[PDB]
Design a protein around this ligand. Structure first.
Ligand SMILES: Cc1cc2nc3c(=O)[nH]c(=O)nc-3n(C[C@H](O)[C@H](O)[C@H](O)COP(=O)(O)OP(=O)(O)OC[C@H]3O[C@@H](n4cnc5c(N)ncnc54)[C@H](O)[C@@H]3O)c2cc1C
Ligand SMILES: Cc1cc2nc3c(=O)[nH]c(=O)nc-3n(C[C@H](O)[C@H](O)[C@H](O)COP(=O)(O)OP(=O)(O)OC[C@H]3O[C@@H](n4cnc5c(N)ncnc54)[C@H](O)[C@@H]3O)c2cc1C
Ligand SMILES: Cc1cc2nc3c(=O)[nH]c(=O)nc-3n(C[C@H](O)[C@H](O)[C@H](O)COP(=O)(O)OP(=O)(O)OC[C@H]3O[C@@H](n4cnc5c(N)ncnc54)[C@H](O)[C@@H]3O)c2cc1C
Ligand SMILES: Cc1cc2nc3c(=O)[nH]c(=O)nc-3n(C[C@H](O)[C@H](O)[C@H](O)COP(=O)(O)OP(=O)(O)OC[C@H]3O[C@@H](n4cnc5c(N)ncnc54)[C@H](O)[C@@H]3O)c2cc1C
Lengths: 407, 407, 407, 407
């Protein structure tokens, strides 16, 4: 239940950095965005500018040793176990920009993990190194608009071998980060040989964004939020051709890569949602103590204290479920954590959604505005019931594993 | 349980008009908005243009006799009872623009009701007539950002008599519609004499928007949605002075006006939410039958049919609770419907929120986008747990009335 | 929304009779049962004695014209439409004994309906007449312990034609009422010819309880409650042989009988649950106003008023869903109410369970005792999520019918 | 997250003993109880006989070193930390008799803790020693029927000093265990001096059950269950007089004793509920895999796998919340676990209630019977939302502590 000496030091360092360095910039960026739209002024394009202060924050973070903390390689990353990194991800979850500032954000962290493990020497030199430096961004392109992508076997976009080339065709969407000016490379997942054995029909391909035949068609909203500057895009691939060396690991290894990498990412997202919920609960308590109606602080009205209690309980038990999952990954590996990594995927976004909805209510109309981070937070938690696989698919995993115990 | 001959005719006429005339325009407007933002193109200001097709739709509606259907006055409105109008409001709730097209939208419908009942002959000639014609828009300004406005007694913005003038000072927000270019008049609610008897301390004032000292400070988002072209604004009043004839009814009558008008508005909103939920359920069923994953239509997976059943039940029982409320208003009046008009205010938005969240989930990632109306619908239902008084305040009314039975 | 003159008269008469005549006896019977068990005294067998006061209450009810009110035949019953009887069933739901006192209790009401519609002249003379007089009781034997009886096609108990006899074998359980000393006849449902067309494989048989080969094996608890004096039994049939005239309608007509009778029964049960919930809410309000803790009446603590409000809303909307179902049965018949009769089956017991659980909580420890009717009420509502088909099966019906609209 | 070597050994030993030794007896006892009542046979009094096999099981447990495992004193108990004992309590929670067999049952464990810490040398020799040996039982008498005892300051039963005696008057109820033939002593909590300082107005008194003026008035049901042989009683005290040495610690120390003992008991109950929920989930999975309807195992129908997943998640996160609470008690003591010990009190019974209700449903009608332990389990979890203080009071504690962080 207690963290290592290193973890305790880093929790304090990360939280201090976020509150002192990141949050003033974060508040300023969000306020300026709100001011422009509130004034019905300016261009749409200017809302997508990368905040200049981010590179300055990244540099400061690097100088403080707060960089690549997600990556367990001690030479290239922070060397942290899952149990050590978990509480750091919670702290980063309290801030929109924090994961980026520490180079720990999705999808880049997951893509770096894929390249570190499965990339060729050249792929690592050309693409992993600039990602590790924070000099470029990437995206992971798996979901397809025209098929129900919650079942990966439905993928119809293709990456096929023709002579010494890989040839890529299709359309992907919800690609996080592709709107960013420095998103220079894509990991494309698609169908290769439908007649191969099950589990060997798909591939991942490393695709530079400047390859002819790629089009970022449009950016997508989540309840009206565009998540600038990286956004979530639609990407089409029309006769995109690369050297066959562009495959990651090789043709047919798509499923193996996904399974091989599974676990840490689920912990990272789930821990960020704990942080998000804490920020929401904190806002709820402050607002509810400060505002008065019907002769009382709002918190003292009706069921509000019961709601606060329920949120405290919910956060705490979910946090512990996630920390336990990290401990399993550290001790028994993914083979001993297969249920846990789906349990936390269901639990965390659902818990956060309910805490945040309670916090919004306590703020009245203002809760739905962007004068507070709650409205954006709600959408974030809601989206995480779908991103990386819907709740229902993960419940299916948990049920299957439970029922297998009775055979 | 059955409607009048007139109501049956109008249900068919309104639904036909919405599907044939309104929805093609509605889809085009929403698509164009989405296309501009998706392309990261254009100005923010152009998103606020009033769709030119609305005046054409309003004219067609008027020509068909589908106009002012909310208003029970048979000369100036449709002459409909609450029971007759209720199912029409449900049909209008299926469409973003429909209430405007039939001149039945909030806040204008409520403001017209106030002026019809309490307006002087001159107020009715100058302001009610253009509202009834659909030539201008209005807003209702009661909520104040710096106080918890769920308790109306907290109002600190003032409308005070000084000689032959009324003098208005303060700040209001969440004023629906004030962004519209044709929003020409405001009904301001504020504190007049704090030392008067309880219930006689507040007033409503008819305030032309071009009066010196009024500033629309900014427009407000609800989860990133701005609800163009009318929006939701912040309005400040700095030494705004009008002839004392600008009071509606007279100084101190604010609470009396509010209580006197109570009932129909609650039915209108609650019925629109039934329509909104039906549209969401319909989308869920279509999508769930058409999309396939894990060997099955999505609807056939896991608990999805149970979710569909629960939504059907929820919509149906809530609809009937609202229709019953309309029947009470028609037979025993507001004095016999005091609990019912708060019951429906709690029930309808909570029911719709849950149906819509279920529908979004079934759509996968696309459910959160504006390729479908579900994301906007969710925010609409969520907001209606706060607009016109939070859930909690209305539960308080219902509880008080129930407990009074045991005295 | 308003009832007929007859219905209004009967609502008042039934409620008056229940409160003045039935409830003093009901309270005395329950108190005596509680006193014996609380004292760890007496025999188990004496708890099953039929309260002598019931025949006196039945006679008084008959004399007042409050008899067979469920049965629409105006000669043999009350002549009431479903809409007229519905509010009477609500009033009866407020009392454990009331349905019996008015001869409107399940399973006898359903069995009388079957015999009235499908019985031969002789079956009606021998068995329907004494049931209509309240002189005997009956039971309906369909559910089988060794198969999942929620799917009627699983029935393995048999009723087969051999020459001029019907031969019955198998085991049934949860047979309501078979413990009663005057339970003289059973309607047995079983498999007849598995090779017949679908829907023509099952039969209902009228089986006198004194037929050789019938054994009432044991009585069953529902959370420790035995529901004396009728209880819920296990009944075995070993080479039970009757004249082939004992079939109701004829061999193979089991499904037709069930479908033909469907609707009114669902309304009766659902309306009784509305009454049950009202009694629970009333207890909650009285107790919560009278008891004081932490300086306040219990109702004024925490979320209790919100809970009271939610119960009022839940009861009211569910009531209206059921009254609407009765109206459909009266106007369009079962063919136009197929979804509604399953909607109410899901809605009513789930609503009542939650209201009752809230009421129990407000009573503290005493809520779980039989010093109040709440504990027994909870079990009643809980059981009605299973009796006459589980929630899930009924959700399946509702979903199927909804989805069929989009074909 | 891992247990000590001792804890791992004892988890295996306790679980093995329960499954091999306790459960055959437990099943036989419950079956015999069910058989008698099902046959409408025998006396009520015979249902209260102490199963003879318990003393044999206690002796075997003692011989195996599985005795007084709750008590941290290494001479008199097992010497276990809270973290070590917690998983043992979970295993005991799987069985009705297990806590008694290991001498770890409430209320005796809590009473032993009180005497160990606060008892005089003589009180420990006369009463603690026979309790530690399992030779007698005890009860804790605090709750009073005529006042809302959720607020301890409402206590109106008195224990007052008159000369060299303590004089006790009043009525207590829900006293667990007082029906047992070997319940020889009571810890009475009552009002002593209402004019003393807050927190010094109440006392605990050690009261032999054979003292003149004590009457066990009646035993109480929880949904029809009497929890033989100890039950839950009503106890009246009429001019009960004892030497003033009968006070535990001294007059006025009632609140101090309660606060001083707080923590371990909450962990014990919460861990037992985890075990109870696991037994329910296990039953649900077995039944759902074995029974078939509509062409499928029941588990494969509708939302049942989602329900199984949700139960697995709920159990797991709640377990971890409780284990964390035990770790806090071991490291920072009750002063650092004040919120946690109320969080687990809310969380565990609510979690178990929902898992059990799901399990009952999957069993169909049989789920409500005592052919399985689920019906009794439901009542146990439900009761634990009230026993040792209602959910609402504990939510109040959690909220207060959370809100204090923002001062
Ligand atoms: C914020 C956000 C960021 C994203 N980022 C990325 C990204 O970076 N890269 C990327 O490739 N994708 C991304 N996605 C896409 C996301 O992973 C998919 O939306 C998700 O996997 C569901 O796929 P789908 O949208 O095709 O939905 P579909 O598969 O069409 O529908 C899924 C729905 O079907 C139902 N369903 C499916 N299986 C079951 C079951 N077993 N039981 C019951 N119901 C079931 C559920 O209602 C489920 O929600 C992102 C999505 C969001 C919202
Ligand atoms: C879409 C939208 C449109 C709107 N349009 C208009 C408009 O046109 N004109 C206008 O004047 N206003 C408008 N409003 C404002 C709206 O009516 C207010 O936001 C609402 O009345 C709450 O007031 P508040 O925002 O000051 O919240 P506060 O009063 O600060 O906080 C309210 C919260 O306090 C708590 N609370 C309050 N009372 C109780 C209680 N009895 N028990 C328990 N908890 C309680 C609840 O959490 C409640 O949600 C609009 C709001 C929205 C979202
Ligand atoms: C108080 C009471 C009185 C009763 N009275 C009578 C009586 O008088 N006469 C009589 O014949 N019977 C009676 N019954 C029996 C009752 O009708 C059955 O218990 C019920 O139909 C379920 O059948 P089963 O018990 O065999 O459960 P099973 O069929 O073994 O299990 C049913 C469970 O399976 C699951 N399930 C089934 N279908 C689906 C689906 N489509 N989707 C998801 N899950 C599903 C659900 O968990 C459901 O609860 C009574 C029961 C009770 C509790
Ligand atoms: C199985 C069982 C075993 C028991 N064993 C014992 C025993 O061994 N010894 C013993 O002394 N007692 C025992 N009890 C009694 C138990 O501790 C009390 O029932 C409980 O403390 C509640 O007290 P009360 O019954 O007087 O309820 P009351 O105080 O009359 O009512 C309590 C209810 O009031 C409401 N309420 C109270 N406070 C709040 C708040 N802050 N916010 C909102 N609502 C609130 C809630 O609805 C709460 O449930 C047992 C009870 C049960 C069910």
């Amino acid at each position: 239940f207690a963290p290592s000496a290193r973890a305790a030091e880093l929790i304090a360092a990360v939280r201090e950095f976020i509150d002192a360095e990141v949050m003033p910039v974060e508040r300023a960026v969000l306020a300026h965005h709100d001011e422009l739209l509130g004034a019905r002024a300016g261009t749409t394009a200017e809302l997508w500018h990368v905040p200049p202060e981010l590179d300055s924050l990244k540099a400061k973070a690097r100088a403080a040793g707060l960089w690549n903390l997600f990556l367990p390689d001690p030479e290239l990353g922070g060397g942290l176990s899952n149990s050590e990194y978990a509480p750091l991800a919670e702290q980063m979850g309290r801030s929109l920009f924090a994961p980026t500032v520490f180079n720990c954000n999705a999808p880049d962290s997951g893509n770096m993990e894929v390249l570190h493990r499965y990339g060729s020497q050249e792929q690592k030199e050309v693409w992993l190194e600039p990602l590790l430096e924070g000099d470029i961004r990437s995206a992971f392109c798996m979901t397809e608009p025209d098929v129900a992508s919650s079942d990966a076997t439905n993928m119809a976009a293709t990456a096929v071998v023709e002579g010494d080339e890989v040839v890529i065709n299709g359309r992907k969407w919800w690609s996080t980060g592709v709107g960013h000016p420095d998103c220079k490379v894509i990991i494309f997942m698609g169908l290769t040989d439908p007649n191969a054995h099950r589990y060997a029909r798909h591939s991942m391909v490393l695709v530079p964004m400047d390859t002819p035949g790629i089009t970022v068609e449009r950016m997508l909203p989540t309840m009206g939020f565009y998540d600038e500057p990286g956004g979530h895009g639609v990407v089409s691939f029309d006769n995109v051709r690369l050297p066959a060396d562009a495959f990651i690991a090789g043709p047919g290894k798509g499923f193996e890569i996904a399974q091989g990498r599974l676990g840490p990412g689920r912990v990272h997202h789930a821990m960020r949602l704990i942080g998000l919920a804490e920020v929401a609960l904190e806002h709820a308590c402050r607002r509810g103590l400060d505002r008065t109606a019907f002769g009382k602080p709002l918190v003292n009205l009706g069921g509000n204290r019961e709601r606060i209690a329920d949120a405290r309980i919910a956060i705490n038990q979910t946090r512990l479920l996630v920390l336990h999952a990290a401990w399993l990954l550290d001790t028994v590996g993914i083979m001993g954590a297969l249920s846990a990594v789906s349990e936390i995927k269901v639990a965390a976004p659902n818990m956060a959604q309910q805490v945040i909805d309670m916090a919004i209510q306590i703020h009245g109309g203002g809760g739905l505005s962007n004068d507070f981070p709650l409205a954006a937070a709600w959408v974030n938690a809601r989206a995480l019931r779908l991103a990386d696989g819907p709740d229902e698919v993960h419940r299916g995993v948990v049920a299957r594993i439970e029922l297998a115990k009775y055979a």
